[PDB]
Amino acid sequence: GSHMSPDRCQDWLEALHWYNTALEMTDCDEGGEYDGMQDEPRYMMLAREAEMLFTGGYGLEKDPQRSGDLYTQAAEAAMEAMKGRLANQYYQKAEEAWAQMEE
């Protein structure tokens, strides 16, 4: 191969189609695919803040609600960036965030 490319363009639809109800673990197969990603990834920022809202971050109080809202937005931006694995994980984390309120 020349360079790992996001040829898994259908995988993010597939991933979100099967859903991820928090407690569903996946392969977590997120390595490094460099093709078409000519953009400054917003989903990492959104997920980083979501993480700060999840476990408590730099001046961010833990809030499962905002945490999931940020993770769901992050998943949108992730699946937008042809990265289904990230979208799935962030969605998995969004579900976990709210699941913590019913546990």
From Swiss-Prot:
Signal peptide: none
Complexes and interactors: Monomer or homodimer. Interacts with Calmodulin/CALM1; this interaction is strictly required for phosphorylation activity.
Family: Belongs to the protein kinase superfamily. Alpha-type protein kinase family.
Function, in words: Threonine kinase that regulates protein synthesis by controlling the rate of peptide chain elongation. Upon activation by a variety of upstream kinases including AMPK or TRPM7, phosphorylates the elongation factor EEF2 at a single site, renders it unable to bind ribosomes and thus inactive. In turn, the rate of protein synthesis is reduced.
Protein name as annotated: Eukaryotic elongation factor 2 kinase
Gene: EEF2K
